[PDB]
């Protein structure tokens, strides 16, 4: 029963720079014992199957460059690339694995 | 009356590094010189007194060991490192006085088909002091939601079993460890070298 | 290197049964987390799916109940969806996943190029 929302559908910035992608959930992700927040961030460009890119809401998966950043409080979440280069422009995902049963938020086109 | 050191390094059975076995040699000469004139052991790191040696050297005590382990892992076996093996399923003491025996052993531990037989701990949230055997098949729990006794979500079973094929090089291929520790311990020495 | 692929789906009469199955090597599927994941074309992604080690858990998703099921054969190292009872929103592009283990979390990692299923 956790209904997502985000704010950028089919978010386009500037044609360069920058990008800024919200999420939040109506149920709190953390956990009272670990500190720690239970919702991830995905890359997937057109076609080839989706990537990591955030774990655990604030870490970088290693396989990809340091300019990614995604941080937030313990019930809202947002992005930081600082540079949009040319071969980033692909769907972004919110995933929410507090609960058993996961759900996958929406997609946010982040191109030109 | 001689050591059996050949029960120790010549068995087939072995156990994985969860849950390790630990033989006392004891009122027992050890051939050493065999130990070292045989040509095959991968490595033959001793931290003793002397890594050489060893004639003219009694003790009153001495720990057998006997490990798998995944090939490049190997050398985390030696004092201050750190890693999955060497802080969570061995770890040996900073002062310590014996020898670590690698060898390899992919002609006799591995199956065409793959030997998923073969177990390692990934997780214990406390760091193991000096080493100490840790048996315990937990189904540790990640919040969410309780574990009603099932591996459900947020639940992760804390023995990982190793990718072990007669395909992968020298990284990942079985390596058959064994710690021979000495402890000069209060009471008279009775294993006499050779 | 370790890889996911996939076989199986295409066309259907309306209600038909199937049977898609995922399959890998490399990682020893004995100790990972492997889930079924949708992309229907132009709509969204969802999840659909989830099974562990010894397949202790077998939770569903909303429309998943009482028309599909996960297996999976670790002597051959992969697993099988079986799909009963079809309906023309369940078309999609569908995606076999793994876990992570501790590290990471239950997040997907490696994905494989995924099959097609549509009723027509
Ligand atoms: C163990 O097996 C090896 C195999 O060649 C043999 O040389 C050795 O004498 C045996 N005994 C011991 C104690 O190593």
Redesign the interface.
């Given at each position: 029963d956790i209904q997502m929302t985000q704010s950028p559908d089919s978010l386009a910035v500037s044609l360069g720079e920058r990008a800024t992608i919200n999420c939040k959930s109506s149920q709190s992700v953390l956990y009272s014992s670990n500190n720690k927040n239970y919702l991830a961030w995905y890359q997937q460009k057109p076609g080839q199957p989706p990537k990591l890119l955030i774990y655990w809401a604030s870490t970088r998966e290693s396989g990809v460059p340091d300019r990614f950043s995604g941080s937030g409080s313990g019930t809202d979440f947002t992005l930081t690339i600082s540079s949009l280069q040319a071969e980033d422009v692909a769907v972004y995902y919110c995933q929410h694995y507090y609960s058993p049963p996961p759900t996958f938020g929406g997609g946010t086109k982040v191109e030109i | 009356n001689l050591c059996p050191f050949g029960e120790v390094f010549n068995a087939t059975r072995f156990a994985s590094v969860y849950a390790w076995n630990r033989k006392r040699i004891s009122n027992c000469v050890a051939d050493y010189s065999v130990l070292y004139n045989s040509a095959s052991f991968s490595t033959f790191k001793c931290y003793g007194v002397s890594p050489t040696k060893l004639n003219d050297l009694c003790f009153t005590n001495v720990y057998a060991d006997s490990f798998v382990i995944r090939g490049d892992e190997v050398r985390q076996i030696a004092p201050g490192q750190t890693g999955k093996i060497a802080d969570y399923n061995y770890k040996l003491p900073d002062d310590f006085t014996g020898c670590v025996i690698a060898w390899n052993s992919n002609n006799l531990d591995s199956k065409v088909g793959?030997n998923?037989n073969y177990l390692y701990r990934?997780?214990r949230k406390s760091n193991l002091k000096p080493f100490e055997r840790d048996i315990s098949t937990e189904i540790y729990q990640?919040?969410?939601?309780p574990c009603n006794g099932?591996?459900?979500?947020?639940?992760?079973?804390?023995l990982?079993?190793?990718?072990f094929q007669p395909t992968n090089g020298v990284g990942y291929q079985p390596y058959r460890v064994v710690v021979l520790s000495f402890e000069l311990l209060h009471a008279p020495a009775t294993v006499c070298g050779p | 290197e370790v890889q996911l692929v996939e076989s199986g789906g295409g066309l259907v009469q309306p209600g038909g049964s199937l049977r898609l199955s995922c399959a890998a090597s490399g990682f020893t599927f004995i100790n990972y987390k492997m889930n079924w994941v949708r992309q229907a074309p132009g709509k969204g992604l969802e999840w659909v799916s989830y099974i562990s080690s010894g397949s202790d858990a077998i939770y569903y998703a909303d429309s998943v109940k009482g028309r599909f099921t996960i297996s999976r054969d670790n002597a051959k190292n992969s697993l099988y969806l079986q799909m009963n009872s079809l309906r023309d929103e369940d078309t999609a592009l569908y995606y076999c996943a793994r876990g992570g283990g501790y590290n990471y979390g239950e997040c997907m990692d490696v994905w494989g190029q995924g099959t097609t299923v549509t009723v027509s």
């Amino acid at each position: 029963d956790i209904q997502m929302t985000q704010s950028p559908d089919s978010l386009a910035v500037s044609l360069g720079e920058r990008a800024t992608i919200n999420c939040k959930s109506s149920q709190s992700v953390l956990y009272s014992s670990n500190n720690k927040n239970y919702l991830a961030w995905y890359q997937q460009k057109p076609g080839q199957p989706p990537k990591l890119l955030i774990y655990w809401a604030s870490t970088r998966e290693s396989g990809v460059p340091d300019r990614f950043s995604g941080s937030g409080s313990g019930t809202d979440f947002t992005l930081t690339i600082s540079s949009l280069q040319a071969e980033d422009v692909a769907v972004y995902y919110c995933q929410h694995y507090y609960s058993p049963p996961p759900t996958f938020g929406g997609g946010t086109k982040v191109e030109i | 009356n001689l050591c059996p050191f050949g029960e120790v390094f010549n068995a087939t059975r072995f156990a994985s590094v969860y849950a390790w076995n630990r033989k006392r040699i004891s009122n027992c000469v050890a051939d050493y010189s065999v130990l070292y004139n045989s040509a095959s052991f991968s490595t033959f790191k001793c931290y003793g007194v002397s890594p050489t040696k060893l004639n003219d050297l009694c003790f009153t005590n001495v720990y057998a060991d006997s490990f798998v382990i995944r090939g490049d892992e190997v050398r985390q076996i030696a004092p201050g490192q750190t890693g999955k093996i060497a802080d969570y399923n061995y770890k040996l003491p900073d002062d310590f006085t014996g020898c670590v025996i690698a060898w390899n052993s992919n002609n006799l531990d591995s199956k065409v088909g793959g030997n998923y037989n073969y177990l390692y701990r990934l997780f214990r949230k406390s760091n193991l002091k000096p080493f100490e055997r840790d048996i315990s098949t937990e189904i540790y729990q990640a919040g969410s939601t309780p574990c009603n006794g099932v591996e459900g979500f947020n639940c992760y079973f804390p023995l990982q079993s190793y990718g072990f094929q007669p395909t992968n090089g020298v990284g990942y291929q079985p390596y058959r460890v064994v710690v021979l520790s000495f402890e000069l311990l209060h009471a008279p020495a009775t294993v006499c070298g050779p | 290197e370790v890889q996911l692929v996939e076989s199986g789906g295409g066309l259907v009469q309306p209600g038909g049964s199937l049977r898609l199955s995922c399959a890998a090597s490399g990682f020893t599927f004995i100790n990972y987390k492997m889930n079924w994941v949708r992309q229907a074309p132009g709509k969204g992604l969802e999840w659909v799916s989830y099974i562990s080690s010894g397949s202790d858990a077998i939770y569903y998703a909303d429309s998943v109940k009482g028309r599909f099921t996960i297996s999976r054969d670790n002597a051959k190292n992969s697993l099988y969806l079986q799909m009963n009872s079809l309906r023309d929103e369940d078309t999609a592009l569908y995606y076999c996943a793994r876990g992570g283990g501790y590290n990471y979390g239950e997040c997907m990692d490696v994905w494989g190029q995924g099959t097609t299923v549509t009723v027509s």
